[PDB]
Each structure stands twice: as C-alpha cells, then as structure tokens.
C-alpha cells in the first residue's frame, strides 16, 4: 500500500443514497452517458466512486469527476467536497462489485496488518485506464482509505 | 449491541474471488437446494455469511449453517471454525448486496463513533426469519463485527 496526502478537491457527478430500488451499479449505468456534460474536468481519464457518510450514518456514494471550481453542475448532478486527507492506497484487482469485498478485507484485516490506523472521513475508489469495465476480472481500481 | 460467543462450527459452501464471474449471490443460489443435506444443524432457521481472510490475504466467504460437531460435511462443502470472539452487532436494513455498504459504513465511521476498536478475526452476516430474500429492501440481516 502507498501512503499519499492530498489537499481538498471538488467532485461533480451523480449520487446514490443507501436508504429504494437503486443500486451503485445502476448509478454508474445512468451516469456513463452523461459524463461528457461535466465541464472543468481535471482529468477525464479518471473517475471517482466516493464512499461518504451522512451525519445520520447513512451510506452516501457519488460517481463523479474531479473538477476545477467555478464550472456548472449539470441538472441531476451534485458537487461533493472531498476534504484534505492522508490515505493508504490499496490496488483492488477484480470486478467493480468485488470492490466491496476489498473494502471489507482492508478494514477488517489489511490495515491492522500494515500498522495503518483509519481516520473517519471520505473514502474513494479511483478509476483510471487500468479499469477495463465493471465485470472484467483484470480491472484494477485504487481504493483510497483515510488514515492518521 | 455487544455480544460474546464461544467458538462454533459452520458447514456450507465457499466463495473465492478467483473464479471469474462468480459472486456471493450465485454462491447462495447454488447453496439453497443443498442446504437440506447438512446434518447436525443448531437451528435451520438461521444461516451465516462468514467474511474471513485467507492466509494469503484475500477476502473469503462461506455461506453455511451452525452445526454440532461430529456430523458429515457434504461433498462440495467445507467446515469452517468461527473462533470465540466479542462482537458489535449492527442490524442491516436493505438488500443482501447492500450488506457491503453497511460493512463499509460500520468500519469507516460507526465503530469509531461508538468508541469500539475492531479486532481482526472472523466477521459474519446472521440471517434469520427477518431476512425475506436477497433483493428485498425490507429484509434485515445482523452484522457481527469482532471487537476488543
Ligand atoms: N448475500 C450477500 C452478502 C454479501 N456480503 C458482503 C460482505 C462484504 C462485502 C461484500 C458483500 N457482498 C455480499 C453480496 C451478497 O449477495
Ligand atoms: N462500481 C461499484 C463500486 C462499489 N463500491 C462499493 C463500496 C462499498 C460497498 C459497496 C460497494 N459496491 C459497489 C458496486 C459497484 O458496482
């Protein structure tokens, strides 16, 4: 795992709430045809799966792009602020639905085995050109885990 | 909810992230018609989704039943030893695939918010009669998280 610090950054995209009928996979499927609408992209080759939490504890997910500030947020989309954090970066090898299994393995075992101490914040999936499709077993996705 | 349990034995079928295209959902689908084969069940109304770690580090999963010792393990099934542990028990409300989202929320935020420290071990999903089916949003499943 790689240790990285990043300043705060802005993400624009479409969101999913853990509390009816929707899924993260359905979120990405409806977002894909609309990704080109987002102006101000830092890097259109990179997308994010933001795993955040509402104050009430509800799981909150945003599929989006890092953007320079000051450009529009399209209809049906939202801006999300990722705060400045320090991260342990784990490379997940497998499908997009298997990301959930990697999160469980990381939090339940891999952090402690590496001596990395998690710090509650905003986690994210980092999709670059190593991501070949949601069901490709050879896809890679980096998982940024906030740490002390 | 804080629960201590002694060690117990679980018999059932395994999921490895290595079989391309296989999923935990398909594991349960192929396990369903064979559940009746397992002798020595503690309670056939309860099933377990064991989230464990292989020696090499991957996520490993067992769908199974708690059994008294000394009965056979059917062909294509395994015995899995759950060690004696202390657990924080969180009730997941939603579909079975959404369990993954609850695990991420619990480990990333909810444990720290409750003052609980995770203790790397064996996690499990606890399915009782509150579980209506894998894609029913009205289902409930208890998540047992090992802690100090
Ligand atoms: N029945 C299912 C249980 C699942 N549990 C998970 C636990 C951690 C990470 C991902 C998980 N995915 C599951 C999918 C299921 O259909
Ligand atoms: N592309 C996907 C990412 C997912 N990330 C998750 C992170 C934590 C818990 C469950 C998750 N499920 C995902 C499903 C996806 O299709």
Numbering used by the authors:
A (entry chain A): 122 to 140, 142 to 270
B (entry chain B): 123 to 270
Quoted from the paper:
BrlR, a member of the MerR family of multidrug efflux pump activators, consists of a structurally conserved N-terminal DNA-binding domain and a C-terminal GyrI-like binding domain. BrlR mediates the antibiotic resistance of P. aeruginosa by activating the expression of multidrug efflux pumps and repressing PhoPQ activation. The monomer can be divided into three domains: the N-terminal DNA-binding domain (residues 1–75), which adopts a winged helix-turn-helix fold; the long central α-helical linker (residues 76–119), which connects two terminal domains; and the C-terminal multidrug-binding domain (residues 120–270). Our most striking finding is that BrlR is not only a pyocyanin receptor but it is also a dual receptor that is responsive to both c-di-GMP and pyocyanin.
Despite great effort, we were unable to obtain diffraction-quality crystals of the BrlR-pyocyanin complex. The newly identified binding site is unique among those of all GyrI-like structures determined to date. The ligand is stabilized chiefly by hydrophobic interactions with the surrounding residues in addition to an H-bond with E247 at the bottom. The residues lining the pyocyanin binding pocket are conserved in many GyrI-like proteins, suggesting that the GyrI-like domains in other bacteria may also recognize pyocyanin. Together, the BrlR-C domain contains two adjacent binding sites within the multidrug-binding pocket. Hence, the pyocyanin binding pocket of BrlR-C domain is quite rigid. It is unlikely that the larger drug molecules located in the canonical binding pocket can slide into the pyocyanin binding site and promote BrlR-DNA binding, as reflected by the EMSA results for tobramycin. Among these ligands, pyocyanin is the only one expected to affect the interface of the two terminal domains in BrlR, and only the binding of pyocyanin to the corresponding site will induce a significant conformational change in the HTH motif.
